[PDB]
Amino acid sequence: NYIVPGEYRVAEGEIEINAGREKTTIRVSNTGDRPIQVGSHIHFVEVNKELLFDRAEGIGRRLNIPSGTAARFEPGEEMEVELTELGGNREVFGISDLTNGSVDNKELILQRAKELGYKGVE
């Protein structure tokens, strides 16, 4: 019984994040010459133009990673990430101005993505 002041004794078990939401694996490629790090809660379809992936599969979704962590893409790197579903009202405003409303308007999001050159609108 060595005392570490303020120490935790955490319970047994694991914490499942984003429990009960659909998960989706997609391949993503940094076609740029500079690194890109993407956070847990950015609408995946609105990330940096030079990331190539199936943009439709980012709609209504974000990275399935612990709150406040990120995925890193070195220049030229391709890798798989897992996405989870946005919750709440499933609405997105601002960020890259591709949605500004319900994530249900896939056609309109992809139309805006294609026109501004977000790579991978199919």
Binding site: I3, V10, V92
Partner: protein, 570 residues
């Protein structure tokens, strides 16, 4: 995806079932529940969740359910529970306890806890958050006492004094309309909440009552002014009309009555018994029997807390210095031996543990330590765990039941007794945002940040010339809450209804928030959260032994305490 519970607790602070050690005590608190949605936890920084379009809403104006301030991932320790939640603040009040962020994309967001353009963030992950301490036994002797209090997590000072005048050095009294007015205007400059007590002495009503009308928040009956049947009776008559509390320091000398004569004068009316054990003052030797009566709200002062090997030697000498006692006057020696008693100081630890004494307080600069009410509360709970074991009521190997009973003694219970629990004393929706963050390692010893009305007033922080604020020297410092006019908006002067109705704030040019004292006359022992026990306390007049349910209450003084030599430079 799953996170093991060690990484989870390191990132976001602990969750349901996790325990946390309080400082270097043997006391463990367990998270009882968690308002979060696992994966939608709020956090602030580079690439984190509270960013525009993400966990921060980019649409809503401040009025549209957006917070001024979110404390993320707080471990709350309060009489209401030990649990995990975000705390939302707006207009200097706590508006939401729950789950903050952006309902655009997050599940589980409390509707009035939107992080928006107008929201400041304080990261409470890994911190314990409590209400500010309510010290109801304060002597206003030396303005340097305020930082001492802030540094140990006290946010409200109730008592009396005009500075280092003998009347103020003995008694929690600002006497008469002029002194009360001068100290109300002084209070404009003190970065802490304040309520002022008038002199609870007189044989006519008007000389007492005019103190309440001038701005006093309450009265103090003190033997040094004459704790006579008349002064007790008139003060309580005034308090029943004015809806304020009376504190009592009774007639130690038994000059005009024994304890039963004081209780007869009180005649079943509500009263705050100060330093009820009696080293700090009262009917020799049996004052502590006050704590068994249903009309008595009983408080300890802090130097008897808890019972240690040095306590008695310290107190016999403290009393000799304080009273100018002479060791060659046998009356002085009989007096001291009648007043400093291991039997009552030992029983005082157990009464605290049984919930028979409801409140802690300092007795700051009169016979008690301005910065050690919170410190000595946890030293007592830890000593009682060691000597008495987990209380029966505990479960899961945690000390949550004892932690709620003891945190109540310096938060909610003094607020209820004073008539100010509508504003302060707990982390509940609708109360003033007086909040203390603690590193668990420093819990009860040195506050990290003290928030007054939703702005930080005091912080342990380092070199002001440094690239970042963590380089040495880290010390307690006043923050922007205390500077300029913001000292007015972050702090409350508590006043009687009559002085408020009579316009005393405008008469004196007070710019501080005005708090109303109320609902003090309609409460008793049963309204003391977790500390509601009434019983027949017997104090043997020959041996000073204390009995409850015909059982002698005694314990040993300890040689060592936690929250002491590990932490303190002196």
């Amino acid at each position: 995806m799953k996170i093991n519970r060690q990484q989870y607790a390191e990132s976001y602070g602990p969750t349901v079932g996790d325990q946390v050690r309080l400082a270097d005590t043997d006391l463990w608190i367990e998270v009882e529940k968690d308002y979060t949605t696992y994966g939608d936890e709020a956090n602030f920084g580079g690439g984190k969740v509270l960013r525009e379009g993400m966990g921060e809403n980019g649409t809503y104006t401040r009025t549209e359910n957006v917070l001024d301030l979110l404390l993320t991932n707080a471990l709350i320790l309060d009489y209401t529970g030990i649990y995990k939640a975000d705390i939302g603040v707006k207009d200097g009040y706590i508006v939401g306890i729950g789950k903050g962020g952006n309902p655009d994309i997050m599940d589980g967001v409390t509707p009035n806890m939107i992080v928006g353009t107008a929201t400041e963030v304080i990261a409470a992950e890994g911190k314990i958050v409590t209400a500010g301490g309510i010290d109801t036994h304060v002597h206003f002797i030396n303005p340097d006492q305020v930082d001492v209090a802030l540094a140990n997590g006290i946010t409200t000072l109730f008592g009396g004094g005009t500075g280092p005048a003998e009347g103020s050095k003995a008694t929690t009294v600002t006497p008469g309309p002029w002194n009360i007015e001068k100290m109300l205007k002084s209070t404009e400059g003190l970065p802490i909440n304040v309520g002022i007590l008038g002199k609870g002495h007189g044989s006519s009503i008007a000389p007492i009552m005019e103190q309440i009308d001038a701005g006093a928040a309450g009265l103090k009956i003190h033997e040094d002014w004459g704790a006579t049947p008349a002064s007790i009776d008139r003060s309580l008559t005034v308090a029943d009309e004015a809806d304020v509390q009376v504190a009592i320091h009774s007639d130690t000398l038994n000059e005009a009555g024994f304890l039963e004569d004081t209780l007869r004068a009180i005649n079943g009316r509500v009263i705050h018994s100060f330093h009820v054990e009696g080293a700090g003052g009262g009917h020799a030797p049996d004052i502590m029997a006050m704590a068994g009566h249903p009309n008595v709200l009983p408080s300890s002062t802090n130097p008897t807390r808890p019972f240690t090997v040095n306590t008695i030697d310290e107190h016999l000498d403290m009393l000799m210095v304080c009273h100018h006692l002479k060791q060659n006057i046998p009356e002085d020696v009989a007096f001291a031996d009648s007043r400093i008693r291991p039997e009552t100081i030992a029983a005082e630890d157990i009464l605290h543990d049984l919930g028979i004494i409801s409140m802690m307080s300092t007795d700051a600069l009169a016979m008690g330590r301005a910065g050690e009410m919170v410190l000595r509360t946890w030293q007592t709970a830890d000593k009682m765990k060691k000597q008495r074991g987990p209380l029966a009521e505990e479960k899961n190997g945690s000390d949550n039941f004892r932690a709620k009973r003891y945190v109540s003694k310096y938060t909610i219970n003094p607020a209820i007794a004073q008539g100010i629990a509508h504003e302060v004393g707990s982390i509940e929706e609708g109360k003033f945002a007086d909040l203390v963050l603690w590193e668990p390692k420093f819990f009860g010893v040195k506050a990290d940040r003290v928030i007054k009305g939703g702005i930080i007033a005091y912080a342990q922080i380092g070199d002001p010339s440094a690239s970042i604020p963590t380089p040495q020297p880290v010390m307690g410092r006043r923050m922007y809450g205390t500077v300029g006019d913001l000292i007015h908006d972050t702090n409350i002067t508590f006043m009687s209804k009559s002085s408020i109705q009579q316009g005393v704030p405008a008469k004196l040019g007070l710019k501080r928030r005005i708090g109303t004292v109320k609902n003090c006359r309609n409460i008793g022992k049963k309204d003391m959260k977790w500390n509601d026990v009434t019983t027949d306390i017997d104090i043997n007049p020959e041996t000073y032994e204390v009995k409850v349910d015909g059982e002698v209450l005694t314990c040993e003084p300890v040689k060592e305490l936690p929250m002491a030599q590990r932490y303190f430079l002196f």
